[PDB]
Amino acid sequence: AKGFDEQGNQIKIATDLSGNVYYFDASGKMLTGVQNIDGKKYYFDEQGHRRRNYAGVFNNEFIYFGLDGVGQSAIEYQFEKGLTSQNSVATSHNAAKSYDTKSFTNVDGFLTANSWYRPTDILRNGTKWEPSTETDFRPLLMTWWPDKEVQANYLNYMSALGLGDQKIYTGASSQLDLNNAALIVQEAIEKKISLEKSTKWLDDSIKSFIKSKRKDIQGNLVDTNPGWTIDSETGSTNHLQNGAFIFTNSPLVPEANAAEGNRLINRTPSQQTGNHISYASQPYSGDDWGYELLLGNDVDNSNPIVQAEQLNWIHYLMNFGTITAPQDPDAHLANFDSIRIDAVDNVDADLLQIAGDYFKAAYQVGENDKNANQHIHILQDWSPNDVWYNQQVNGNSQLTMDATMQNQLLASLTRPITSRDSMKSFTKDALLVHRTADNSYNQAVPNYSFIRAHDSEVQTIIAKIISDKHPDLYPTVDKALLAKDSALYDEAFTEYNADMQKISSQKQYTHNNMPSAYAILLTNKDTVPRVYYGDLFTDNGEYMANKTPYYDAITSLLTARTKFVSGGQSLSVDKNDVLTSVRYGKGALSATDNGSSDTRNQGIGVIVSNNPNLDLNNDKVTLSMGISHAHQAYRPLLLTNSQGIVAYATDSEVPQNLYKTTNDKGELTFDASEIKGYDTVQTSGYLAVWVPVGASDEQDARTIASTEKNNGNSVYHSNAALDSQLIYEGFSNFQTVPSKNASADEYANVIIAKHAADFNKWGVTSFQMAPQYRSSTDGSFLDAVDTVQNGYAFTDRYDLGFNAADGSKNPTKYGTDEDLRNAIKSLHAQKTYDGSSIQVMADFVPDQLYNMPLEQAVSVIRTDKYGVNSENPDIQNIIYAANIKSSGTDYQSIYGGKYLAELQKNPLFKSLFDRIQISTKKTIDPNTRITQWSAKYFNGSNIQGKGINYVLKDWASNKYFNVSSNDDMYSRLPKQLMNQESNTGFIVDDIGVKYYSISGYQAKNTFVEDGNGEWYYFDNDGYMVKSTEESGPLRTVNASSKKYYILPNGVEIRNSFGQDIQGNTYYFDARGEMVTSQYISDDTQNIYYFNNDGTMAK
């Protein structure tokens, strides 16, 4: 393949479309082998290509062709020969006062880049060496660095702050110059310190140096110290916070090691046993979407001491009043009643049983409906299989969510017209509870159903808006949940709120048909509905301060549910796709049922279409109420017209003409004159609700719980009593956060108390409050940004808003502990239809803790959210300074495990404590108290961006510095810092080459990278490994089965092809290791295959 130029076809510096560099001799023949061009040697393979990073003997010359494609003599040493002493006049002075904990700021003995130490003397005001006081600490990085590049970067950085030599240093620069320039930098530092009377400025500029960034040869900002930033913590992205560590044991860090057979990750309901078990049958799915590492620092709920602490916590919540306000004689009225188990799919399912046991023990919930229905818990179980795990395995100790209902309501009603399912879908088979002919009790699986929630169908709508406005910063919805700038939310919200006010056909972001959905939800049989604050009030702004467009319609339904909704049910959808849901009224379970005395004035009927151009065209819609409703007058509760939805609240508000009367089969019959298609803010399609005329004020459709003893597996039973319950989720993420000096009546828990009667009027029986735990403000996630401190991101699980130490009121987002106790008392003081108090639900959040105050050394592996090793070589059981230890002066320390001694002694709890837990196969363990959270109680954590090499360590010895131990497994301090002889560099010897780190220690059994960039290895004897003629270049070095290619000068080549003296070719990856049974892509798009042997294919 000759090479011709455009102007003329000459060959005598030729290129190719791939980049391959041919050079043809005079007259057009390509050359191969070793060639000399302009006094440089260049290697051309047998294909003709000029090649870079290629090593081999050619004509009895070992030549390494570098990135240039230019030969270097492998025999000649490529390192600087000579040592350099690290002892100077000042090292006697800068040496540590003492070589122990008292003179070094440290992490479990280990050191980090932000370690400060106490020298024996201070250069006071840069002019006189004085003995250092106790407080005369200086940053380690002022006098010591882990290698020359960091020292160099440090020198230039300090100089750029006016504290230095205005000239440029690099790892190329000499060891002795860097040391002398450091001293000049030290004078300037110390003069600044005398002037300011402070080192905060210095701490600030050392901290900011570490994370500093740099322009490079390419011209883009890199990290100046990659090993000390998140940049170095690379692995899988599949975790909400872009990475995750698993804590693992290691002899270097004895106190962070967990016991044997703890840290059982992924014990989700489906996989509690250790293996998936589909509990689901023919129509239903048995999938599990769970995973152990969700957010923040992951509590290990497979540890039995932790499990007991989870119990302890539930007891504390259920007795929060009596515990926190003993002097108060009404303390017993300020206790939580129920729990919401949170992130069920992200914790050991053993907790679901721990909790079920507790309520059987404390409140005897197992004996009947009356007791069971007095404490209604709910699971946050998203996975399809959990519904059936809950039933078969877990009794029904907590209520499962009906997600088939939620998704159907969303797909058939809320979507835009393009995306929307048919109303027929409501009669389908995959639905959890068949309602076409629901005519029994105690058959359905007990469940709560809802449409939206603080998280579900809210925070993701907001995040989509942020992402669509700033794709460059946040390109997905999951990544937008990490947005922290209050400006970004305000902006998104003015859009969100504006969209909600728009007609349905122009609703670009927010849900359609919300009242229509709520009409079906609130009139459905066999479920406990949950209402989201944000469907009555706006998701943002002040608590209960602004109504949505749906408030009238939804509140109308909510009160109407109280009066009319009872009895059997039937759903239909006529030829026109118009849904008709009917409740027959109490005492009547079918359309052919004559009923009781209660039936006549009860039993609602609902009409829903989802088609904005519904044109009946001589067809009729029919509401078959019962034969128990024949010849009966009916009147509307809700109706849609072009202005919106009308809500009639009494018989007398209805104009007489709108009344209409059933025929003899109890059928209502609607014309095209009545039902048509619409497009408003609140309805695309039609909506109507009809109630029977003549109901009384006394009338209440609900039913009292049975006292009869239940000998069943399930705690709850889907019947009339249970359908009489309703849950109201009483909060939003984006409620405005009462500012520091907010007046007392902004706080949501005060507002709650005021409006207590309103919730009772709506039929609320279980008030689901927000989590009450004081929030982090670190913005590591949505829940923890300061403009939404919702309480799912906390450090102290026992602190629900206590006053400060000085006795100043110091609230949470929602109010003080006082204000909470009162909120509970107000709700408790309200009494529902059966005379009993409105329940108050605690958010039980066992999964994680955010934002802990103290560091601890731990061993880590880089993984994804499921726990799967991301297989980063440099993050395999390494040591990390993790923020993972609680203060030990927090409320955890007071109340942690406090009641376990008390609870064991109780006879009623014997079952609970004696119970063998499924995943642990051991019982719960209440004999240890948890007053300080430590790393040993955590499965792992999200990546904290400290850096891999944040924990300091000597490259030559390859051990970690440790100031608290003298054990050999750690390196002792740098010889310079303890005023001993210390030299650094490569030193050639009659036997071979040794190397001493900047710390003064000998390289033994390690790889070492030169300042020039070449790697070298040092054997057990402390000598460089180097191939000889007797021993070829292809070599194992460390009993690892890993072959490297080491030239005669000791250079261990990387990202490079190497040769046998025989003629075979091998490729050595980024880590210098030989490649085997694989294809290699070249920069110029050439492909090479390497066999299992490691040889290149041909």
Ligand SMILES: OC[C@H]1O[C@@](CO)(O[C@H]2O[C@H](CO)[C@@H](O)[C@H](O)[C@H]2O)[C@@H](O)[C@@H]1O
């Ligand atoms: O919020 C994101 C994600 O987490 C889930 C897990 O069930 O929500 C629960 O757990 C989170 C951390 O505790 C909280 O943000 C959230 O408020 C809580 O409901 C999912 O609902 C959600 O997809």
Ligand SMILES: [Ca+2]
């Ligand atoms: Ca977990």
